Structures are given as C-alpha cells and as structure tokens.
C-alpha cells in the first residue's frame, strides 16, 4: 500500500547510473599518463551519464535550461567524487573508478597519483566512518547537484530554492529510516566539506589540462566543461551553499 504511493528516494534509486568500465588494458605496465588518460575518457562518459541522471530528477527539467547547464557545470566533479567515494566505500582503502580500474597501493604510489586520490579517499573514509546508508547517499548526491549557484543568482532561483529544500527534507526522511538531528548535522557537515574536496580535485585537474608539457587527452564533453570553468574560478562568481556557516 505505502509503495503504490512511491517515494522521491525510491525514484532516485531507479535512475542511479550504471557502472561503466574503463577498458583499461591490464596486461601493459601502468604509468600515471595511461591512467590519467583512461580516467579522462571514463570521466567524459560519466559526466554524460550524469546529465541523463539530472534530467530525470523530479524538478530539474522545470528549471530554466540555462540553470540546468550551470548546475551540471558547477557540480559534475562533486558528483564524480561522491559517486566514486560511494563505490570505493563499498569495498579496504582503494579507489574503485571502475571494476577494471582500481587504484591500488602500487598505483597510488605512481608519480602524482596520491596527491589527488587522497581527496577521493577522504570522501570514501567519511562515508565509511558515518556508515552512510544507500538512501542517505541517494539524497545526498542529489543535494550535491544543487550545492552551488552563481553569486548573482539563477534564472529560476525561486524554483531552485524549493527543489533544494525538498531534497533537504528527503534526506531527513532517509536519516529517520533519536540521534536523528545529530546525524543530520554529521551528514550535512560531510556535504559542506565536499566543496574543499572538489576545490582541490579541480586544481589538479585544471592544472593538468593547461599544461602543454603533458600530452594528455580529455574527451570533448569534458574539455568543454573544463575550459568554460577555469575563468569562473579565477573570478569567484560562484556561491557555495553551506548547511553550516
């Protein structure tokens, strides 16, 4: 009976993106170059999938088209890191970018690997520390899509504010599933921390993108989102939403 009245979280499940493979040749030696390149390709495909995901999120399509683009542009890497964090959490201290591309000890020690992977690792150990459930995870990931807006405001700023409060409430129901308020503070503290995480992730990603001495392929989808983004960070026209001040 209560299912015939389907929940918001239940839909969030359905639309949760499939696991993609990296198609990484496991019989050639590794190098930071090869992994970075294979992760760029995988990532391009993850972002495209995130777009299909976002559009299926109740309310998102109703935002102005320009807003939708702005939110995916601001948050793709929040979504990447958080989904990877979750993936990894679910199975020791390894980043499980894909069933056939897991960043193990040896890989971690590759030139320049840990200096970024640790940030993904931080997301992973937080999920594990808090024993975040799957439903809290779903609600939390949707809130990451909505974690950043232009300093001057979105065009559908009112509808954005609504939708976002809707999912803050959805997270609350997930948590309830007495220390409920305490958990809400913990989970929303994690959400907030994602800004610093992604801030770092993007520096080491953008830097790699701008360096000419590093012949490194990004797929077009990503290259686009990256180019259009570097400036906005210099400019700081990005308002980062905080649950706790």
């Amino acid at each position: 009976l209560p299912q015939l009245t389907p929940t918001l979280v239940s839909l969030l499940e359905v639309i949760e993106p499939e696991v993609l493979y990296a198609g990484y040749d496991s019989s050639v030696p590794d190098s930071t170059w090869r992994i970075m390149t294979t992760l760029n390709m995988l990532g391009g495909r993850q972002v495209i999938a995130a777009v299909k995901w976002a559009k299926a999120i109740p309310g998102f399509r109703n935002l102005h088209l320009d807003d939708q683009m702005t939110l995916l542009q601001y948050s793709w890497m929040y979504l990447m890191a958080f989904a990877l964090g979750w993936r990894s959490y679910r199975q020791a201290n390894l980043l499980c970018f894909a069933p056939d591309l897991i960043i193990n000890e040896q890989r971690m020690t590759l030139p320049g690997m840990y200096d970024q992977c640790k940030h993904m690792l931080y997301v992973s150990s937080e999920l594990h520390r808090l024993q975040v459930s799957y439903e809290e995870y779903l609600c939390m990931k949707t809130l990451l899509l909505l974690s950043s807006v232009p300093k001057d405001g979105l065009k559908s700023q009112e509808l954005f504010d609504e939708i976002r409060m809707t999912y803050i409430k959805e997270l609350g129901k997930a948590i309830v599933k007495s220390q409920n308020w305490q958990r809400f503070y913990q989970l929303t503290k994690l959400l907030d921390s994602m800004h610093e995480v992604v801030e770092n992730l993007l520096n080491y990603c953008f830097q790699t993108f701008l360096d000419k001495t590093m012949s490194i392929e990004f797929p077009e989808m990503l290259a686009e989102i990256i180019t259009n983004q570097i400036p906005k960070y210099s400019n700081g026209n990005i308002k980062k939403l905080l649950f706790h001040q």
């Binding site: 777009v51 559009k55 088209l65 683009m69 542009q73 077009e220 686009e224």
Partner: peptide, 10 residues
C-alpha cells in the same frame, strides 16, 4: 557548450 546544451535540451 553546445553538446551539454544538446544533451540537456534533448
């Protein structure tokens, strides 16, 4: 930004 625009406006 056309492909993102394309993907969204689909």
């Amino acid at each position: 930004n056309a492909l993102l625009r394309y993907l969204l406006d689909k």
